[PDB]
Amino acid sequence: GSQILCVGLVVLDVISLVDKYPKEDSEIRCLSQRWQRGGNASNSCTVLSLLGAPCAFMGSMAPGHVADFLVADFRRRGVDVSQVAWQSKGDTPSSCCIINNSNGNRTIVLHDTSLPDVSATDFEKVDLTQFKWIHIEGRNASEQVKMLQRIDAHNTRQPPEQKIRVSVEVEKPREELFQLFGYGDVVFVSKDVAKHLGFQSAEEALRGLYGRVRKGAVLVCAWAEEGADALGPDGKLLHSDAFPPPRVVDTLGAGDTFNASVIFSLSQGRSVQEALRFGCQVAGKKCGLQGFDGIV
């Protein structure tokens, strides 16, 4: 098993770069424009790829010129798309992204297109033998849990040296998702989810939510410019300072870059401290750049 698989969304991001966020009802002129292959699982694949780890994306896509663009980009990055759950109903999602060039704040107006999510069925049709690691962007709970149990099963029939590592991201404050909290060896929970659950810091969210996780799991929580924290089975809290760049110019997919990096690091044998640290280092570098290119 040599590849890392990420399961979630792909999206066409239509980006405008402005030097100040527009006031309601006003009209600004943008500095520059570009398109980008977005979506969480999609972004992660880009980062894993640029870091040298063979990987594969799996999510829904409607055939057309949009998809043509996205696939071209995938392949230009060496991301295996063979596992894509093609469709006929709905369109491929897109979004308008305003990025504030004076602090890299990014505002996203998303357009979901009814596109049916990957289902337990779809996943059942996948050859788990190719994959050292599988990461799942929490969207359709019920059905995703099903996929998770399938991987455990497969694991219960393997040497502890041939099991598939599983990470899970609960990014949205949404009750259906808290079941995911859940499975996997590594669980990512967003700052946004932690506040909405009443918590006002990472160590606090970490102490509050550790109870929900599979025995032996590592819970991970990033907190933007305050760094990231983690907490595992020994009860010892781990921390890493951020690596802010001098000028923050674009934070679109900062958290995806963080997630990808921590996975990469852990999948390469490194410790949780080290992975946490590396997570912060790559995310920091991305935020000082437009897009993904220059991080390596």
Which residues of the chain form contacts with a copy of itself (CB under 8 A)?
14, 16, 18, 21-33, 35, 65, 68-69, 91, 94, 96, 98, 100, 105-114
Binder of ligand LJ9 out of 76, 225, 273, 296 (CB under 6 A): 225
- Does position 36 interact with ligand LJ9 (CB under 6 A)? The reply is no
Calpha distance 203→189 (Å, rounded): 12
Annotated binding residues: 13, 39-40, 43, 106, 224-227, 253-256
Which of a copy of itself, ligand LJ9, none has residue 73 at its interface (CB below 5 to 8 Å by kind)?
none
Strands 165-170 and 60-61, by their bridges, are: unpaired
CB count, 10 Å around CB of 102?
12
- Does position 183 interact with ligand LJ9 (CB under 6 A)? The reply is no
Residue 107 contacts residue 98 (beta carbons within 8 Å): yes
- Does position 287 interact with ligand LJ9 (CB under 6 A)? The reply is yes
Calpha distance 258→265 (Å, rounded): 11
Which of ligand LJ9, a copy of itself, none has residue 125 at its interface (CB below 5 to 8 Å by kind)?
none
- HSE-CB at 166 with a 13 A cutoff on CA atoms is 27
- Does position 105 interact with ligand LJ9 (CB under 6 A)? The reply is yes
Q: Select 14 or 120, whichever has its Cβ closest to a copy of itself.
A: 14
Which of a copy of itself, ligand LJ9, none has residue 254 at its interface (CB below 5 to 8 Å by kind)?
ligand LJ9
Span of 7-15, 55-63, 132-140, 241-249 interacting with ligand LJ9 by CB under 6 A:
241-249
Retrieve residue 273's tokens. 């401290």
* Nearest distance, CB of residue 275 and ligand LJ9, angstroms: 12
Residue 35 contacts residue 117 (beta carbons within 8 Å): no
DSSP string, 118-164: P-HHHHHTS-GGGEEEEEEE-SSHHHHHHHHHHHHHHHTTS-TTSPP
CA distances from 254 to 14, 22, 40, 64, 73 (A): 17, 22, 10, 29, 19
Which of ligand LJ9, a copy of itself, none has residue 225 at its interface (CB below 5 to 8 Å by kind)?
ligand LJ9
List interacting residues with ligand LJ9 (CB under 6 A).
Answer: 25, 105-106, 222, 224-225, 227-228, 242, 244, 248, 251, 254-255, 258, 280, 283-284, 287
